[PDB]
Amino acid sequence: MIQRTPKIQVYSRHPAENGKSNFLNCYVSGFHPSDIEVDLLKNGERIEKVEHSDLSFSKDWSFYLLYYTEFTPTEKDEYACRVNHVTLSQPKIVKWDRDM
Amino acid sequence: MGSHSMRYFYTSVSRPGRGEPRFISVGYVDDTQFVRFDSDAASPREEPRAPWIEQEGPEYWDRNTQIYKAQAQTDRESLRNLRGYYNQSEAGSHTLQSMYGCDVGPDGRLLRGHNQYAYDGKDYIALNEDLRSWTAADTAAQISQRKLEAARVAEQDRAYLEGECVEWLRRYLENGKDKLERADPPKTHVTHHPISDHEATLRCWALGFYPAEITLTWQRDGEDQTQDTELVETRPAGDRTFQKWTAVVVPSGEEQRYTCHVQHEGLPKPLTLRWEPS
Amino acid sequence: TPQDLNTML
């Protein structure tokens, strides 16, 4: 165990448009070992219906997973991804920015 | 490079005090997942994960289920063996990963086969490109090599890689033809955000593309830039396509000196983009 | 289709 900490991107399936249904994605990659905890947050609160992809890995043996949920972005609502892994002292939160 | 690949990815993870090791497999054709199996599922079975595989009969799912169940049991023995080879205690969690499959050209002919393994994320042993000999990473893997040679595994792997692996990949490519042999080009645009009243960020976007392989590069006065640039990892959209962007910080007033170059299999010709102010 | 071998290390 040299371990590797996850890279984290938070983004939407389609370009965001206020009031239009879409999917919110949190893509975690580059990590080892494979146990990981990922939550999607709306205004700091855990979203309940979140799905994820089947565990797979890259050529360098690092794992990746996509977590996703349906959502309708607004001007005001804030979204984020919260990640915990053995490699992190405390969970990491990455805020959704609609231009990233 | 009208070429295709089939890959299987197996992950076995021990968890002392929390049951026996979990085995997960997934199968891909190119960047498209098509099957899974999870030993932690309420009733473990190979399951379809793409529309074109659903047509396979019960004999397919039953056989493959049996294969993964046997392999899960054998990985558990491998894990116990590996713990002994490295003189490790019983208390810790360990991972054994396997990845294998075949690459074929436009005509369906084998280009290359693969069958290799990692222990705790580090290369452990690999079938060489010859499909006859092994490369072991250390003295522990040398023991595994000796066992693999005694059981004549490389011979059997050669026969799978040159035979079934290519014949099934060909079958999948024909049955999923509409998606698997379709390249979707990127939809591109460049955005501009002032950082300060003397710098701005130019961000070059590619969306909706398939397969995942792409190159996005920023040039200044036609020379590639890696200085004052940020490039994110290609990421899945969740509707089979991928996304990527690259950004560069530029001096205000110098935007016209910057071009974004995009290469993708779906593109007849590479694109050169610039920021176009409204 | 996966390989029908159950290879041990």
Numbering used by the authors:
A (entry chain B): 0 to 99
B (entry chain A): 0 to 277
C (entry chain C): 1 to 9
Question: What is written in the article reporting this PDB entry?
Answer:
The HLAI residues that are polymorphic are mainly those forming the peptide-binding groove, which contains six binding pockets (A to F) that define the size and chemical characteristics of the specific peptide repertoire that can be accommodated by each HLAI molecule. Cognate T-cell receptors (TCRs) expressed on CD8+ T-cells detect pathogen-derived peptides presented by HLAI molecules on the surface of infected cells. In this study we focus on two HIV-1-specific epitopes and their presentation by 4 different members of the HLA-B7 superfamily, HLA-B*07:02, HLA-B*42:01, HLA-B*42:02 and HLA-B*81:01. We show that single polymorphisms between different alleles of the HLA-B7 superfamily can induce a conformational switch in peptide conformation that is associated with differential HLAI-specific escape mutation and immune control.
To explore this notion, we first solved the atomic structures of HLA-B*07:02, HLA-B*42:01 and HLA-B*81:01 with TL9-p24. Although peptide positions 1–4 and 8–9 were in similar orientations in both HLA-B*07:02-TL9, HLA-B*42:01-TL9 and HLA-B*81:01-TL9 structures, residues 5–7 in the HLA-B*81:01-TL9 structure, which differs in the peptide-presentation platform by just 4 and 3 residues compared to HLA-B*07:02 and HLA-B*42:01, respectively, were flipped into the opposite orientation. In the HLA-B*81:01-TL9 complex, Asn6 of the peptide acted as the dominant feature pointing out of the groove. HLA-B*07:02 and HLA-B*42:01 have Trp at position 147, whereas HLA-B*81:01 has Leu147. This side chain had a substantial impact on the position of the α2 helix of the HLAI, evident by a movement of 1.7 Å towards the peptide for HLA-B*81:01, and altered the interaction between the HLAI and the C-terminus of the TL9-p24 peptide. The altered position of peptide residue Gln3 in HLA-B*81:01, compared to that in HLA-B*07:02 and HLA-B*42:01, forced Asn6 to swing up, out and clear of Gln3 in HLA-B*81:01. The smaller side chain of Leu156 in HLA-B*81:01 compared to the longer Arg156 in HLA-B*07:02 and Asp156 in HLA-B*42:01, enabled peptide residues Leu5 and Thr7 to form interactions stabilizing Asn6 in the flipped orientation in the HLA-B*81:01 structure. Overall, therefore, the altered network of contacts between the TL9-p24 peptide and the polymorphic residues in HLA-B*81:01, compared to those of HLA-B*07:02 and HLA-B*42:01, resulted in the upward display of different residues within the solvent exposed, central peptide bulge. Taken together, these data demonstrate that, from the perspective of the TCR, TL9-p24 ‘looks’ completely different in the context of HLA-B*81:01 than it does in the context of HLA-B*07:02 or HLA-B*42:01.
